[PDB]
Design goal:
Chain D: This is Integrator complex subunit 1. This is part of a larger assembly, with two copies of chain A, one copy of chain C, one copy of chain D, three copies of chain E and one copy of chain H. Chain C contains seven helices and no strands. Chain C is mainly α. Classes of the chains: A mainly alpha, C mainly alpha, D mainly alpha, E alpha+beta, H mainly beta. The complex binds zinc ion (2 copies).
């Protein structure tokens, strides 16, 4: 009762302005995503030129998938941290997260920085077509 | 890793590179032309298996253990010989000590599937 | 910086080769090289596979072997002695260090190097598994 | 390798399908135009309207079609009548506006009178054809 | 049977009807016949498996297909004249069927979509960049066409989490409005 | 089957919509019409067999 | 690794070479020419060894 | 060694089965439904490539150069004919979802040369 009737004075909202970041944070997110895509391209090139030595305990496919997932997870974590550092005290996503009432830091990172990797049964999106995820890609495309 | 190899199940399915049956009625002149004086040291049919270095050295196995396991599992009916540890060609030859072709096929299936090194 | 070796695909990182060239060109930077190498060797990388951690330790130990071959001998063997008994490092790493050292060194040897390298080769967890016979024969006949 | 001397045609469809053999197609079309210039409009007027497909590749053939339409008299009158009657049979090709443009480009009191006669014949036919004639006139005006 | 190995098997509605020794020009001819509304109707699926030599032609019912623009030499076959004719759709009686009969759009089903190199937008058809591909065969008419009736009501559905789009597709069937104009009778 | 065992051909996907057909109103009503026309013919046999044992002609409307 | 055929309105599984000989091809060149189109591939010949052996 | 195929009878044209005779010490290929026998040109009665490192370049046909869904490179010219454009792809065999080795096919229709970088 006391907290609701004080909230009548203080108020609590959420809107578009809580979902945006400044231009510097957007440049950091885009730089991290570009760096990650370049790293995945380099790992693809290394596996394609047979310069990728497999890790012990798994074949070339599993070590390539592990390297790609490591790069994409590192990108997701870095972009999430960069989005979290841009939040002000007045941010309402942060207000609901750090009160524990609703949401998480992952939700803020997905709204602001990057949604991330979509998974089906613990792996990336499978080649439902003939060596393609969709007909808009080339065959044997293992990129992000 | 030594205990891991002592625990993990290993047959010839996971250690040989390719197996082949030939016809060698005269062991003094073998059809593969690979050290017939070693072949000097009874059925005309032989079972010739070939191993690979990587799977042999992963389990740290040697041909003496495999040959003794073959002899223990099959009695005196099978004669196994082995050489070329330093010649980069991992070969064991198995003959029959006294229609035989189906028997070699059956014992080859048994060696590759149903006996444990 | 954490999550660096996790993002390295090659067997040996290029910066470790930069350390190798630093040790090759100059000898005054050898304590700094060894300090960085023991900092990385003592670091636990929980984000890597256990075999990936083991081969990373082997790579750092290869850099240590190069540092030993470039004249900075006694502190490296002292660190391996420290790692053997009063530290819980992998005995396979110590055996790999002994194998790498004994494949590049030839007689004669000094008294200090023999006195510092003999106890790690007679620790009952190294000598039995692990040429080394020529080295122990030379150490027995000379020292 | 001959012109006319038959009732139906077989090399017209072969040269049309083989066109993308493009050099002999022009020679075959020129031979057919020279044979039909003397005119024999009972079957050589509807079968002469071969289905085209290339515009940029067959711009030279479209230009030579203007010389093929210069035979005049019956060879132009029956061709214009067939081109007018082709609109009632769902002429879904480039021969409904570009082929009629060659007659329109050579409208030296020939295409106008023939078009007026075709409009009078269409009006004298069954009803619900004034909209088709108006659409054809609008398309001829906008295309030319 | 010695000629089977080099030639391409041809299946019509799953029935092996023979072999062809020149499958590329045969598939070009079959495509040219289908684009021109010839004896091959527009809903006939013609799939050429290239890695293993087969050509499958499907004619039966039940095949789910969608229209796609046709891309040749990194250029749309759809030109400004088709759009200009479609603008006065009720005037010159130019329709969707005339757009199909012009060889501009064609219906690609799922099996034929395996063999289709497809552009999402005509902005993918630019040779100035590396362009990621230069052998595009088809283009999307619009990428939003993948949604159904209920999902097309969602404004900005690409800015929502996907289960919320699913929930809205469920609850748009429960909304109140005027369900039909003749509800009085 | 051999190419699948050799591995030269990938195994077929059951959920691939190229391997699936949609039975619309037409095919479903055609299946029903096949069953019911077979039934209608069957009682035409029944009626004609009942009326042919007496040697009398039978009306098709009946 | 024998190849078998499950037939409609037959309860028990039927070897494929028996079906091929039942179609009117009493040979092995005919059946294997219908099955294997390339004689320079001996691996398919190895995998059709046991069906012919069981259909002896 | 190498894989052994089917060799066929001459009269009934069935497959020739291997048979052993006790007089000549040579392998015989006897068809056992019309007793036709044949001399054995090879002693390899049966081989089994169990590692089956198959040559994927043999399994690739040159027709895939005109697949529109395959990517292209101008950076790997054809060794046989010098054409710069070539398609590339990975192997699709069941034994090859453990490597990402590229296989190239020349785009030029005359040669269709396939290789591996
Ligand atoms: Zn025979
Ligand atoms: Zn070439």
């Amino acid at each position: 009762t006391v907290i609701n009737n004080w909230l009548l004075i203080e108020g609590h909202t959420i809107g578009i302005g809580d979902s945006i970041a400044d231009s510097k944070t957007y440049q950091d997110i885009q730089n991290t995503i570009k760096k990650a895509k370049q790293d995945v391209i380099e790992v693809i090139e290394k596996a394609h030129n047979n310069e990728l030595e497999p890790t012990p305990g798994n074949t070339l496919r599993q070590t390539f998938e592990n390297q790609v997932n490591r790069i994409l997870n590192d990108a997701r974590d870095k972009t999430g941290s960069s989005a979290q550092k841009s939040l002000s005290e007045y941010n309402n996503f942060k207000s609901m997260v750090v009160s524990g009432a609703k949401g998480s830091k992952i939700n803020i990172s997905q709204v602001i920085a990057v949604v991330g990797q979509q998974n089906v049964e613990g792996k990336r999106i499978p080649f439902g077509f003939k060596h393609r995820t969709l007909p808009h890609f080339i065959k044997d495309d293992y990129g992000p | 890793k030594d205990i891991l190899c002592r625990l993990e199940h290993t047959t010839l399915r996971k250690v040989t590179a390719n197996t082949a049956i030939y016809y060698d009625p005269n062991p003094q002149s073998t059809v593969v032309a690979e050290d017939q004086e070693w072949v000097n040291v009874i059925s005309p049919w032989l079972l010739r298996v070939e191993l690979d270095r990587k799977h042999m050295t992963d389990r740290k196995l040697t041909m003496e253990q495999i040959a003794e396991k073959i002899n223990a599992g099959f009695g005196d009916d099978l004669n196994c010989i082995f050489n070329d540890d330093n010649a980069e060609k991992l070969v064991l030859r198995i003959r029959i000590m006294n229609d035989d072709d189906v028997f070699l096929r059956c014992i080859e299936s048994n060696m590759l599937t149903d006996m444990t090194l | 910086e954490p999550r660096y070796f996790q993002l390295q695909t090659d067997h040996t990182p290029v910066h470790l080769a930069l350390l190798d060239e630093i040790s090759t060109c100059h000898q005054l930077l050898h304590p700094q090289v060894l300090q960085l190498l023991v900092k990385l060797f003592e670091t636990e990388h929980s984000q890597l596979d256990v075999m990936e951690q083991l081969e990373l330790k082997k790579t750092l130990l290869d850099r240590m072997v190069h540092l030993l071959s470039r004249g900075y001998v006694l502190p490296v063997v002292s660190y391996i002695r420290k790692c053997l008994e009063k530290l819980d490092t992998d005995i396979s790493l110590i055996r790999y260090f002994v194998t790498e050292v004994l494949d590049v060194i030839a007689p004669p040897y000094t008294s200090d190097f023999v006195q510092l390298f003999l106890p790690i080769l007679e620790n009952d967890s190294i000598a039995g598994t692990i040429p080394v016979t020529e080295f122990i024969a030379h150490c027995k006949s000379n020292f | 390798t001959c012109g006319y001397k038959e009732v139906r045609l077989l090399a017209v469809q072969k040269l049309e399908m083989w066109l993308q053999l493009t050099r002999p197609a022009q020679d075959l079309l020129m031979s057919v135009c020279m044979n039909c210039n003397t005119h024999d409009m009972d079957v050589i007027s509807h079968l002469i309207k071969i289905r085209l497909k290339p515009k940029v590749l067959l711009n030279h053939f479209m230009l030579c079609i203007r010389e093929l339409l210069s035979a005049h008299k019956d060879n132009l009158g029956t061709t214009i009548k067939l081109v007018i009657f082709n609109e009632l049979s769902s002429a879904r090709n480039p021969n409904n506006m570009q082929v009629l443009y060659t007659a329109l480009q050579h409208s030296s009191e020939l295409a106008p009178k023939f078009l007026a006669m075709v409009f009078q014949d269409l009006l004298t036919n069954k009803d619900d054809y004034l909209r088709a004639s108006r659409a054809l006139l609008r398309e001829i005006i906008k295309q030319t | 049977p010695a000629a089977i190995a080099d030639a391409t098997k041809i299946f019509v509605n799953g029935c092996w009807v023979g072999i062809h020794k020149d499958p590329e020009q045969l598939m070009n001819t079959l495509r040219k016949l289908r684009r021109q509304m010839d004896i091959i109707v527009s809903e006939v699926s013609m799939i050429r498996d290239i890695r293993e030599r087969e050509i499958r032609i499907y004619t039966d019912a039940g095949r789910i297909c969608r229209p796609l623009l046709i891309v040749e030499k990194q250029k749309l076959l759809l030109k400004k004249r088709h759009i200009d004719q479609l603008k006065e759709r009720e005037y010159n009686n130019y329709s969707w069927q005339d757009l199909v009969a012009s060889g501009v759009v064609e219906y690609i089903d799922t099996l034929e979509e395996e063999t289709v190199m497809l552009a999402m937008t005509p902005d993918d058809l630019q040779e100035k960049e590396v362009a990621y591909c230069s052998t595009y065969t088809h283009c999307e008419i619009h990428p939003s066409m993948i949604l159904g009736v209920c999902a097309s009501i969602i404004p900005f559905p690409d800015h929502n989490q996907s289960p919320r789009n699913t929930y809205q597709s469920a609850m748009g069937k429960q909304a109140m409005g005027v369900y039909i104009t003749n509800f009085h009778v | 089957l051999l190419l699948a065992a050799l591995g030269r051909r990938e195994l077929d996907d059951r959920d691939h919509y190229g391997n699936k057909r949609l039975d619309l109103a037409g095919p479903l009503l055609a299946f029903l019409f096949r069953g019911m026309f077979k039934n209608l013919l069957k009682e035409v046999r029944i009626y004609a067999q009942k009326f042919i044992d007496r040697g009398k002609d039978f009306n098709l409307e009946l | 690794q024998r190849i078998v055929a499950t037939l409609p309105y037959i309860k028990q599984e039927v070897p494929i070479i028996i079906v091929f000989r039942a179609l009117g091809f009493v040979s092995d060149r005919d059946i294997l020419e219908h099955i294997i189109y390339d004689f320079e591939d001996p691996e398919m010949m190895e995998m059709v060894k046991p069906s012919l052996d069981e259909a002896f | 060694p190498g894989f052994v195929g089917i060799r066929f009878c001459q009269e009934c044209n069935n497959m020739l089965y291997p048979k052993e005779d006790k007089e000549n010490r040579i392998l015989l290929y006897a068809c056992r439904n019309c007793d036709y026998q044949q001399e054995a040109d090879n002693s390899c009665i049966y081989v089994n490539k169990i590692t089956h490192e198959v040559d994927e370049l043999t399994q690739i046909i040159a027709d895939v150069s005109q697949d529109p869904t395959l990517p292209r490179t101008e950076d790997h010219p054809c060794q046989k004919c010098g054409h710069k454009e070539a398609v590339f792809f990975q192997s699709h065999s069941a034994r090859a979802e453990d490597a990402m080795r590229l296989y190239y096919v020349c785009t030029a229709p005359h040669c269709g040369h396939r290789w591996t970088e």
